[PDB]
């Protein structure tokens, strides 16, 4: 049951994987399946998540106060802390199209 798989960062952190690789990994997976990867936008990370059967990509910013999707929520000290927050909190607060949580690590 617990601990949830998100605690093993290897289940969702796919390092320097590009967009096309991410889409290949998420193809056919259920809603809420996700990964975290480096972005083509240097200095940034990206979250790729299945929403309504489709893969969406969101930038993760790193700032002096922490990682986050947008001000004033760039509050997390590590990517793991971010992931754990959004495992229980829907991304809809940032965009009404994203009604999903980070529920299922791609490799759990």
């Amino acid at each position: 049951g617990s601990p949830i798989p998100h605690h093993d960062e290897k289940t969702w952190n796919v390092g320097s994987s590009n967009r096309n690789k991410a889409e290949n990994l998420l193809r056919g997976k259920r809603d809420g399946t996700f990964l975290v990867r480096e972005s083509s936008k240097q200095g940034c990370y990206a979250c790729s998540v299945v929403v309504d059967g489709e893969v969406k990509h969101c930038v993760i910013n790193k700032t002096a106060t922490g990682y986050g999707f947008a001000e004033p929520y760039n509050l997390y000290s590590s990517l793991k802390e971010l992931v754990l927050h959004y495992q229980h909190t829907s991304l809809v607060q940032h965009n009404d199209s994203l009604n999903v949580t980070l529920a299922y690590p791609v490799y759990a």
Binding site: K56, V59, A70, H94, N95, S97, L98
Partner: peptide, 5 residues
């Protein structure tokens, strides 16, 4: 990328 506010 999806716009996030």
């Amino acid at each position: 990328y999806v716009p996030m506010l």
